[PDB]
Amino acid sequence: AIPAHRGLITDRNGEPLAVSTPVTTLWANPKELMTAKERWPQLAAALGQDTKLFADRIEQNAEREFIYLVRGLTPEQGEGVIALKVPGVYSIEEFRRFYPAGEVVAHAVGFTDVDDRGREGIELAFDEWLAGVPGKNAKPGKTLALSIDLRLQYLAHRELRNALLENGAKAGSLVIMDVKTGEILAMTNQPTYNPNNRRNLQPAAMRNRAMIDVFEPGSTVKPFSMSAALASGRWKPSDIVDVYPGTLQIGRYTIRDVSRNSRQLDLTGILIKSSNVGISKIAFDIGAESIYSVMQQVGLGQDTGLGFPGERVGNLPNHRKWPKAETATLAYGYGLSVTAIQLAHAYAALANDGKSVPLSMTRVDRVPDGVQVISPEVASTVQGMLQQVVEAQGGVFRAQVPGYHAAGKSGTARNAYRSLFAGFAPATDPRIAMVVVIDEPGLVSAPVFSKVMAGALRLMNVPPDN
Numbered sequence: 001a002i003p004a005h006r007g008l009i010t011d012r013n014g015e016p017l018a019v020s021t022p023v024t025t026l027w028a029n030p031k032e033l034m035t036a037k038e039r040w041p042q043l044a045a046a047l048g049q050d051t052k053l054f055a056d057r058i059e060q061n062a063e064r065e066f067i068y069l070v071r072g073l074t075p076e077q078g079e080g081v082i083a084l085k086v087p088g089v090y091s092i093e094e095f096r097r098f099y100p101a102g103e104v105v106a107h108a109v110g111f112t113d114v115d116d117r118g119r120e121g122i123e124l125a126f127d128e129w130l131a132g133v134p135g136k137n138a139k140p141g142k143t144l145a146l147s148i149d150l151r152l153q154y155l156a157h158r159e160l161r162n163a164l165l166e167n168g169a170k171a172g173s174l175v176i177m178d179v180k181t182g183e184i185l186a187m188t189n190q191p192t193y194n195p196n197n198r199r200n201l202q203p204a205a206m207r208n209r210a211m212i213d214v215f216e217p218g219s220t221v222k223p224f225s226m227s228a229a230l231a232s233g234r235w236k237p238s239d240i241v242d243v244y245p246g247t248l249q250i251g252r253y254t255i256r257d258v259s260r261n262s263r264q265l266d267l268t269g270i271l272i273k274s275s276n277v278g279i280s281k282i283a284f285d286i287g288a289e290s291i292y293s294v295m296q297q298v299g300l301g302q303d304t305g306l307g308f309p310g311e312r313v314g315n316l317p318n319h320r321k322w323p324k325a326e327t328a329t330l331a332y333g334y335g336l337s338v339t340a341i342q343l344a345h346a347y348a349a350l351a352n353d354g355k356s357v358p359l360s361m362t363r364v365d366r367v368p369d370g371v372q373v374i375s376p377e378v379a380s381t382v383q384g385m386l387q388q389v390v391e392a393q394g395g396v397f398r399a400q401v402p403g404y405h406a407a408g409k410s411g412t413a414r415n416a417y418r419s420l421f422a423g424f425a426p427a428t429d430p431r432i433a434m435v436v437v438i439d440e441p442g443l444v445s446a447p448v449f450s451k452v453m454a455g456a457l458r459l460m461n462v463p464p465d466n
């Protein structure tokens with residue numbers, strides 16, 4: 001077994017994320033060591049090992065011809081412990097993984113085990129491509145450029161970490177997507193870990209929250225309920241719903257708005273004020289089937305096909321016939337469960353004039369053809385409405401991106417609550433879709449969207465549209 005050089009992983013711009021570095025691995029023929037017992041303690045000492053346990057190991061493996069002394073000394077360390085000239089103690093040239101970017105891309109990149117086999121993230125998902133084959137000569141693995149832009153990953157990392165301090169939040173995730181190419185430009189979770197130093201790792205730090213944390217998305221799916229309304233042929237943006245007095249009794253169940261200073265709202269109005277009553281009334285009119293079908297088409301509670309280890313799917317229940325309560329709770333985003341990634345993919349499809357491009361964690365050179373999941377006119381209309389949610393008076397002013405026109409929706413996700421913002425920018429010719437998730441910290445995640453989106457657009461040289 002002559003181990004193969006494992007393929008380099010870079011960011012989209014070639015910055016190194018996972019590098020296999022030549023290390024030395026001392027191994028021993030025990031049967032040949034049992035003849036030079038007087039050398040053992042010099043050997044043990046140079047391996048910073050206890051003489052008795054070193055000896056006890058060797059003694060008990062007397063009838064075996066292979067054991068590992070130390071795995072992965074530097075070039076000149078392993079050469080010092082072979083210059084002692086101990087009988088039965090030979091050299092192997094091996095490869096150790098180093099992660100130059102560390103904490104910043106830990107969850108995305110993942111890491112290899114003691115064998116240099118993929119254990120988490122991209123290192124596992126692309127193991128066959130990255131590994132090559134052992135020596136027959138050893139054929140080296142192949143280079144992999146990720147979709148991640150390390151400039152955007154660091155900006156996203158920095159800003160989510162800050163926002164978690166201010167709000168005394170213990171966890172969160174942030175996803176950034178290219179709405180045109182389906183590329184994940186940034187995926188960051190907190191807490192994070194350094195994959196270079198893996199002794200005592202709190203298992204909550206290992207959780208890739210963007211891909212495994214499932215939640216009811218709440219008010220962030222209203223734009224998709226609105227898309228279904230505009231495609232029904234029964235609703236235009238300027239049509240009015242009466243939401244007074246901000247409550248609605250469903251037989252026994254009672255729906256309450258957070259803001260109840262409204263009678264007549266147009267369809268834009270229902271999104272600015274985020275009226276559960278307004279969206280429920282529309283939902284009764286068009287039926288839950290139209291809402292289910294839009295949500296399914298944009299990939300909520302659906303397999304993302306990233307083939308990424310651990311990635312959860314959530315659940316979008318096909319009740320086939322919905323009573324009035326299940327109709328309302330689906331329309332304002334309880335009664336389904338989704339990941340941050342699914343929700344950013346859905347928003348990407350909306351931002352890209354209703355065309356869903358398949359998700360990619362790898363650099364996309366030739367973009368695959370999208371699928372038209374929402375008609376281009378409906379998608380253009382809902383973009384206009386979500387621009388008003390950020391821009392208009394009463395709106396989420398703290399999501400405004402100075403220089404650009406941003407579009408988006410806040411929500412509270414669900415037991416345990418997360419603060420959510422989902423949006424895209426620029427509103428005129430959308431480039432980036434973003435989802436922010438902050439655990440049990442409306443106006444928490446929205447300022448992060450603002451700061452990270454301002455940086456991302458400038459880092460991608462998107463001309464200001466305002």
Ligand SMILES: *C(=O)N1C[C@H](NOS(=O)(=O)O)CC[C@H]1C(=O)NNC(=O)[C@@H]1CCCNC1
Pocket residue numbers: 217218219220256257258273274276332334409410411412413414442
């Ligand atoms: C959205 O997630 N909503 C709608 C509303 N305002 O949204 S926002 O803060 O402007 O983004 C209020 C918060 C949230 C919501 O609906 N929360 N709770 C509900 O009313 C449901 C009642 C049933 C149990 N929890 C959900």
